[PDB]
Enzyme design. Structure first.
Site, PDB file in Angstrom:
ATOM      1  N   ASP A 106     -50.204 -37.193  28.083  1.00 17.47           N
ATOM      2  CA  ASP A 106     -51.183 -36.621  29.062  1.00 17.47           C
ATOM      3  C   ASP A 106     -51.123 -35.372  29.863  1.00 17.47           C
ATOM      4  OD1 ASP A 106     -53.837 -37.117  30.495  1.00 17.47           O
ATOM      5  OD2 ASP A 106     -52.891 -38.587  31.502  1.00 17.47           O
ATOM      6  N   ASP A 155     -60.994 -36.238  30.591  1.00 18.95           N
ATOM      7  CA  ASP A 155     -61.578 -36.718  31.854  1.00 18.95           C
ATOM      8  C   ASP A 155     -63.027 -36.406  32.139  1.00 18.95           C
ATOM      9  OD1 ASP A 155     -58.916 -37.623  31.983  1.00 18.95           O
ATOM     10  OD2 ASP A 155     -58.614 -36.447  33.958  1.00 18.95           O
ATOM     11  N   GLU A 202     -52.177 -29.666  28.823  1.00 22.28           N
ATOM     12  CA  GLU A 202     -52.703 -28.433  28.814  1.00 22.28           C
ATOM     13  C   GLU A 202     -51.813 -27.181  29.267  1.00 22.28           C
ATOM     14  OE1 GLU A 202     -54.120 -30.814  30.747  1.00 22.28           O
ATOM     15  OE2 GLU A 202     -55.594 -31.306  29.219  1.00 22.28           O
TER      16      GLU A 202
END
Ligand SMILES: O[C@@H]1[C@@H](O)[C@@H](O)OC[C@H]1O
Ligand SMILES: O[C@@H]1[C@@H](O)[C@@H](O)OC[C@H]1O
Lengths: 680, 676, 457
Positions: free
Chosen positions: B387, B457, B390
């Site tokens: 998770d 998200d 980025e």
């Protein structure tokens, strides 16, 4: 989140960000935002607003609304802004993609909810300096967008295009846009940057600025939007009668005798001619702004004879100052020159090391005008060719130059407006009432300084012709009604070549139905000057001939009849020019300007209206001898070339021989009787 | 202007500018350009090329030419480049607008002649530093463009759109594009920047870089382009069997007992379940990478019971390192952390002051892997949820951060690839085969490190669902076959709200025909932790329940049948997954991938192919109970829900009750018999 | 080259560069220069000048001259400036090293003739932005230089030293210098930068600025120079009598009981004590600006007893605002906080993620004062310990922070003066006379706001 409201002003603020929305003319709002202590005093292109009828500020659903006639702005409690017309239709909404904004969680039911974290009013601080601004708005699926100025691209509708907000030779950023949704918007900010009308998001960008500033207006028709914009940034003056006739020019009539022989030859052949032009480097050196007496022995005698002949002389002005001249020394002393930020203090290297005069410096404007007044205007010259108006840096490194009003990155785009202003104010002060000057570039509001803009040093191709048609129509939508081109284009036309001759004829035929009809070019084969240098100053070459008899007998007959047609149109052109002065309407305009309720008027880009009464369908391809033409519904149309009457609301397969482009006249318009329509 | 030609390489040079074109796999060329003394050694996403036998370099008039199979590049005497296919058709041409170029006057008869002075290969020097790069190409009026990765926008065809080349939560830049003109192109450059496919000009931009680098490929079909791209940047591995089943997750199972009670309820009801997931903040602190034994007393016992049930456990990995941890101290000593250029040395402030591990540092990759190995993999966990990939800076000021491989402006977009690599290389070295990890982000070539990407998200709306369909299809085109979403979206779904329940059903029905079927979200009403802090460490909240029985009995029956349908689909999914591994074809494909000769296949953006044999037409609006479906020509189609036969090459108005979306099976495909 | 002269102002100009010299108090001149259209309205530390009656402006040969009492400035036709006293002695001379200046050849018989091309007034444009300023003066062989503020170095005379014009814990840039040649000079510019009094050349530097601005004064004695400087930037007020006694403090009296035990024990031993101090983190959170009642259950009773004992209480004020506090929320809404230009919006991480209040923002000064007034001053506390006054960024990356008055690079050094001003103006408005607060840092003129500075950690 805090609203500070009055009965005619909406302010919202959070964390030093101030958003201020207020009336700015009928049906119009000004929007400013800053994170500085207060808004500054820069109004740029906006004139003082006439006080508004019936402004209403209100609060509802934790939002604030300001209505000014046909437009309203809604700012929600998160500081997010959207605009609606009087029927409640969405015109423009800010683009937000965040999870947290204005100290609050974003609404998960909204398309605004996103971890990406893009703000609609991004004032990104530059370290040690000011702000890099991005104003983001949502794209809309149906939206068609026009205006923005003069760009070298085959697109009238620019939805899906990205335009540089910068001035370069053949480009003019005039950042007023008109939308098919029924609003117009001026980006009231002269900073170097970009506008992208991408399908996924609309983004306006300024590299360096102190604050966000834009003006937005709404009306049920394009004509009203154009009028409201002209009220905001200034009306075009009334065009002088001589400017609707034929302008003869080339690069370059090198001597007084050469120029006068062309003029006399026009009068000897009983051809129409209203303006003749002395192109660049007729001067001793750049920055002298006078005739070189060796090639131009008696300018007043030239001007006097031309007046007897009914011809106005226009002269080239270059904004360059060569560092060997007397004026360089004086202008350097007074701080009237643009400055290089780094490297050698030279902004252009064409035929000498020169520096541009600073058109944003009021002192420099006055200095340069008074040179031109002394050496040209006092002799009876009433038109100036304000060339290199961007200005044309040898290298467009906008970051490396600074003006009186600040870095070129912050204020650069206003340069051409100031250049036009210098001559307009000067000429008006000297007692001239009707003023037109030929400008190569412009910014918002340039129209108020009598700027006839032309599209610069484009190549001589059918590709260029197509680009010029779109650019000129978009310039008109951006509030510049006085616009023209070099007939034939500028660069690459060999006068003996059949391919160029065909282009020339098509472009001339279009030129008859442009706001100004002007022949100019740098024709091949070019001729080097006899001596490369004189007194250490590099000498300027010339192109070949560029008169209407220079391209053979058959072409002469076509161009002669083009001149005669243009003469017959002059009364109509002057009526349309008056309407531009009165209403902000362009002279050459897209079909939707006159027929906004017809779907095809918003789709067709290869036809236009020359005023309200003439439908023009140019030929944009080599070899083409026919084309289709849509005739707008609501009137009958008279074919100019055959005299046939055609009902509106149909497509015609029109003959387009070398001798004529398809043109239709609105039946029973006053211009019909003013033309000679032959039966074939 | 000088050409330096060899049998398999074209070089052009003027004023220190070097343009180098060479074969790079069949039907493909690599293009590089620099004004530095030489090209550097950075290959980024490109693997070593299998040698091309058919390369031919020629000179003619003032030009030079290089052909490699179905693509050729022509460079004229002014250094201006264009590409053609084997039929001589124009694929792509550079955008030049100058009067003077390569020491020569420009041709006035060409659209290249202009005073504006734009170069096609603009290497603009940054003062004291490297170069700001813009590569410009002419637009074409008929060109449709696909790929580029995962963008939150309702456009499959991205001609006219501008995409940021940066990584943010819910966005993934994977900069391979496929054009309808018959070529594909990889921007082989990880710099922060932008690609604008504007109607007036195509511009690729890199904020900071050493050199221009791209890879271009030509073929008569999309399938061949996808294959050639997968050979260039790496094949997806084989998907492990268990990944084709149902993945159950929520934000968040807070304890071992809570997680186990869900798994036990699935088994109690004989429902399919292949993977169950422990979401974030199951750990004592960020950077510990272990279970907190206060809430997870016996992880081994959880994994063993799950194994008895036939369920794999996936665990949340965060790349964050809280500065109070032992691992921060040691990683700081070794230089394994990302650095702030200015200001406080903190990259994220979510529940602690954390710094990201540096996924571009090979040492940091090994360190983080070995922590996860010791605390998770050695216990029998074989799927990781990578998770925040980025990585998710609290503030996306890319200019303010620096990695091992250089400033984030220059190299930033490769972070998610390195993050996936850390775990894939680690798990491979530990003896695991057929690896899959759930990555939130990717770059070019991430597919080779077993990256199952999901779209982050996003909010729980029909607008979001529509964006996800487009994004997933474009990810497949960009070479990422393993892709999925949070069924129902991530943020904003109240489990008691009828409107959300309708969205949930529609999204679930679509999820059955996604490469992975995965239920996840942060459902309302959320619950704050009982204690805001414990030992000074901010505690993480939870959302509401998110199991298939949590939304009433009517919705339970629908989702139960969805799971049963997904199980029947598994052999077909494994066949399509093997094909992705073998040929680089996506799993979920736009219609034009399987029907490139049909006009409608290049226009329709609300239907797709789930492998070669299943046509899927999702319902993308609340309240909709029927929709139009175009059936491609060339085969008959069997309605999944009625068994009715329909001829290809027609529009049908299809029934779409709440309980089913329109799905059609290619007649006589093996999957037809498998599904009824 | 052009002089624009009046009876009390000398202006020289060439190519947009304007040099303006004028009287600014007795025996004193203000010097400003810019390449902007005009001089801005920033006076920074300079108070309005009392009118000088005998000021004499002349021009001779190609030069111009302005005399004001004991100081005169001479500007030659090339715009080069030097200062002299009433005895004709050279005080300060601009450093030029060029072959061509102000459109004219340089004099080959002068030390100013040099191909190096250094200007005395270098306003180097920052691309897209303002100016990087270097002001160069000739060094002088026997010049001794004093002042400049508070630097951690064993040198009283700082000829040969280089001082950072920045605020850091234990450092205070107060850029007034006094020379043994018989002049004083204020660098009236709050920009981050440097002053190097090198043996080969003196250079003042500003990283970001709109214009050059300094004030220069001449007199026969130090005492006169110090007097003239106090007239220019403001007199220290009269110190209150308690401040000359003994101040007892430590890091830290944690409770009301602990502090009072120490106070009472001083009185029990008949020892002198005038001030006792409650150090930092006596509050619930940073930005609450009140006593934590768990450790300080009755502040009023503490203050009243200390008053009976003849003792003043001082309390620690930190300028930090922790992001979990109520004052953070409100101060963020109003724009009263310092901002980071890039990265996480956090200026200090000591015992929490905090952001500094913006002491250059008038509204923020008033907001913080009124918190301290409600929670401390209304209870009878008369002295504030204005700690972290620089402010103490966790990382001193000056380029990464911005204030109400502009980037820290341009205006940063004035922060401690505004912090002092916030409390001085507020306490004066509340009716207190003879104000003294303990400041960790200062800028030129901080003395007028009752700033008792101490040399930090
Ligand atoms: O129109 C031309 C103008 O754009 C410039 O280049 O100077 C010469 C003119 O002929
Ligand atoms: O999907 C979520 C992920 O994107 C991140 O926010 O961590 C929690 C997860 O539930």
């Amino acid at each position: 989140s805090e609203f500070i409201l009055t009965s005619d002003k909406l302010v919202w603020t959070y964390d030093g960000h101030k958003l201020q929305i207020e009336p700015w003319g009928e049906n119009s709002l000004r929007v400013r935002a800053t994170v500085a202590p207060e808004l500054n005093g820069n109004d740029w292109a906006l004139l003082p607003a006439k006080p508004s009828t019936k402004v209403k500020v209100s609060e509802f659903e934790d939002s604030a609304r300001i209505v000014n006639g046909n437009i309203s702005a809604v700012v929600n409690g998160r500081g997010q802004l959207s605009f609606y017309n009087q029927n409640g239709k969405l015109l423009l909404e800010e683009y937000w993609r965040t999870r947290f904004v204005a100290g609050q969680g974003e609404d998960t039911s909204s398309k605004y909810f996103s971890p990406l974290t893009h703000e609609a009013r991004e004032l990104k601080p530059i370290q040690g300096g000011k702000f890099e601004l991005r104003a983001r708005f949502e794209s809309q699926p149906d939206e068609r967008i026009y205006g923005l100025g003069q760009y070298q691209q085959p697109f009238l509708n620019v939805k899906g295009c990205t335009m540089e907000l910068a001035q370069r030779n053949s480009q003019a950023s005039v950042p007023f846009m008109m939308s098919s949704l029924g609003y117009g918007m001026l980006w009231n900010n002269p900073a170097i940057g970009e506008v992208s009308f991408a399908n996924n998001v609309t983004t306006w960008m300024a590299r360096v600025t102190e604050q966000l500033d834009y003006w937005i207006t709404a009306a049920d028709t394009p004509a009203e939007i154009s009028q409201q914009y002209a009220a905001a940034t200034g009306a075009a003056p009334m065009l002088p009668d001589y400017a609707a006739g034929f302008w003869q020019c080339k690069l370059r009539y090198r001597t007084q005798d050469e120029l006068m022989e062309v003029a006399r030859e026009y009068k000897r052949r009983s051809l129409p001619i209203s303006v003749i032009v002395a192109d660049f480097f007729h001067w001793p050196n750049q920055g002298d702004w006078c005739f070189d007496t060796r090639e131009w022995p008696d300018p007043k005698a030239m001007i006097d004879e031309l007046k007897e002949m009914g011809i106005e002389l226009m002269v080239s002005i270059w904004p360059t100052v060569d560092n060997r001249t007397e004026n360089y020394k004086i202008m350097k002393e007074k701080g009237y020159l643009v400055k290089a930020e780094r490297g050698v203090p030279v902004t252009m290297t064409f035929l000498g090391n020169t520096t541009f005069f600073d058109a944003t410096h009021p002192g420099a404007r006055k200095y340069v005008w008074e040179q031109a007044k002394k050496n040209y205007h006092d002799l009876g010259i009433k038109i100036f060719w304000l060339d290199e108006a961007e200005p044309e840096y040898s290298v467009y490194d906008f970051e490396n130059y600074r003006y009186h009003l600040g870095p070129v990155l912050e204020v650069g785009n206003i340069y051409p407006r100031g250049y036009a202003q210098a001559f307009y104010e000067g000429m008006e002060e000297a007692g001239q009432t009707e003023i037109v000057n030929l400008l190569r570039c412009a910014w918002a509001g340039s129209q108020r300084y009598g700027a006839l803009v032309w599209s610069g040093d484009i190549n001589s191709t059918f590709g260029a012709l197509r680009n010029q048609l779109m650019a000129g129509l978009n310039m008109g939508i951006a509030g510049i009604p006085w616009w023209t081109t070099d007939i034939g284009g500028f660069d690459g036309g060999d006068i003996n070549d059949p391919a160029f001759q065909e282009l020339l004829i098509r472009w001339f035929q279009w030129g008859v139905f442009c706001p100004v009809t002007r022949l100019h070019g740098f024709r091949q084969p070019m001729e080097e000057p006899a001596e490369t240098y004189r007194d250490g100053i590099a000498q300027c070459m010339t192109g070949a001939a560029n008169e209407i008899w220079s391209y053979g007998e058959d072409n002469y007959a076509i161009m002669k009849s083009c001149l005669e047609l243009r003469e017959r149109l002059r009364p109509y052109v002057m009526r349309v020019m008056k309407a531009a002065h009165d209403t902000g309407a362009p002279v050459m305009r897209p079909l939707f300007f006159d027929f906004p309720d017809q779907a095809e008027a918003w789709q067709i880009e290869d036809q236009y209206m020359f005023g309200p009464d003439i439908l023009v369908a140019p030929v944009l391809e080599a070899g083409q001898r026919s084309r289709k033409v849509w005739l707008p519904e609501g009137c009958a149309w008279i074919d100019l070339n055959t005299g046939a009457r055609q009902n509106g609301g149909q497509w015609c397969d029109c003959d387009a021989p070398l001798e004529a482009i398809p043109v239709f006249i609105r039946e029973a318009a006053a211009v019909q009787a003013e033309l000679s329509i032959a039966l074939e």
